[PDB]
Structures are given as structure tokens and as C-alpha cells.
């Protein structure tokens, strides 16, 4: 329901490496900006075979 | 009888007739042999009516066909074939992608044919 979004806006520092500064900051910043979505298709997830039914229901 | 007309009658009339019998077939879609016979006929008419072009309810009825075959007395196998052929029909435009989820002389001659009245 809520997750690391508020971490991202609050844990804005030190969520990655910091033992040799200069790469520490770059890695931390990279983890701040999380790596923007991909499809999967029906018959591939929880309750697979409603998905085709999902693909069945619009000819208004 | 019917399939001859259905496969051949004017496509515009097909629109009219099917639209006239959409819910007329929706309800009846869902001794017992008579039920099975009517259901064969329904599949045999829906599949051919699908064959032309894709009301608002049209969305749902598709699913109500597939399950019909999925059952795990020979009339029952005929029913399985009926449902499966109907699905094969309806799967044309829907799931168009893969993963289908298994003269003087002539006129006078006719005038004389008229005179005898027999061709």
C-alpha cells in the first residue's frame, strides 16, 4: 500500500556504498533514481486464465 | 435446412436477423437430449454468423462457448465438436494474434412455349 517511495523522498542519503567516497555518491544517486514498464500477457500471472477473458470483453 | 440460408443469405439480412436474436440466443445458450440438440443448433448458427464482421453485449458470449467443449451419449461428442467448431469460427478476428487458448427468335420461341405452356 505504501513503500520505499517515501524512503526515496526521505532516505535521500546513504542507501548504497559508502566506504570510498567519489564512487559512493555516484552509486547512492544511481539507487535514488530507480531504473519504464514491460508487458507480460495473459496466461502468465495470478489467476492466469481470466486474462484471455480480459481480452474478450469489448465489442460495444 | 437453416445452414444453407445462413451461409448464403444477404449479409445485410444477416445483420438484421442476428441483431434480432442476440438475447434470444444468449439466454437459451445456458429429456436432456433435447437441450443438447438445441445447443448444437445454436453453435452451428453462431459460428456461421460470426464469419462476417464483429450491440454492446457482444463482448461476453464468446467465453460461454469454449467451456462447452471442455467437459471431461455420442451426442455428447457431437456437442463437443459443435462447441469446438463454433470457437474455431469466433477465433478468427478475436485472437487474430497467436495463443488461441485451446431476341426475336428467342422471344417467339418462348411465346410458343407459352402457347403450349410447357418448357
Amino acid at each position: 500500500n505504501h513503500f520505499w517511495e517515501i524512503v526515496v523522498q526521505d532516505g535521500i542519503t546513504l542507501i548504497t556504498k559508502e566506504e570510498a567516497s567519489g564512487s559512493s555518491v555516484t552509486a547512492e544517486e544511481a539507487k535514488k533514481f530507480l531504473a519504464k514498464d514491460k508487458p507480460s500477457g495473459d496466461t502468465a500471472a495470478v489467476f492466469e486464465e481470466g486474462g484471455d477473458v480480459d481480452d474478450l470483453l469489448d465489442m460495444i | 435446412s437453416l445452414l444453407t440460408l445462413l451461409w448464403h443469405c444477404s449479409l445485410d439480412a444477416l445483420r438484421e436477423f442476428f441483431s434480432t436474436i442476440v438475447v434470444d440466443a444468449i439466454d437459451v445458450l445456458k429429456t436432456f437430449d433435447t437441450q443438447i440438440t438445441k445447443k448444437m443448433g445454436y453453435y452451428k448458427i453462431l459460428d456461421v454468423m460470426y464469419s462476417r464482421l464483429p450491440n454492446e453485449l457482444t463482448k461476453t458470449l464468446i467465453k460461454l462457448c469454449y467451456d462447452a467443449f471442455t467437459e471431461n451419449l455420442e451426442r455428447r461428442r457431437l456437442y463437443h465438436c459443435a462447441a469446438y467448431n463454433c470457437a474455431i469460427s469466433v477465433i478468427c478476428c478475436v485472437f487474430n494474434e497467436l495463443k488461441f487458448y485451446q431476341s426475336t427468335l428467342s422471344e417467339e420461341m418462348s411465346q410458343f412455349d407459352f402457347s403450349t405452356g410447357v418448357q
Side-chain angles (χ1 to χ4, degrees), chain B residues 1-6:
Chain B
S1 52
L2 267 297
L3 61 83
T4 68
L5 271 298
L6 321 177

Side-chain angles (χ1 to χ4, degrees), chain A residues 39-56, chain B residues 63 94-95 97-101:
Chain A
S40 173
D42 53 344
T43 308
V46 174
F47 302 119
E48 272 195 345
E49 295 295 329
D52 45 10
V53 188
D54 171 30
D55 314 335
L56 181 142
Chain B
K63 175 48 67 182
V94 188
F95 283 169
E97 81 278 12
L98 73 165
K99 184 259 302 175
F100 274 32
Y101 183 65

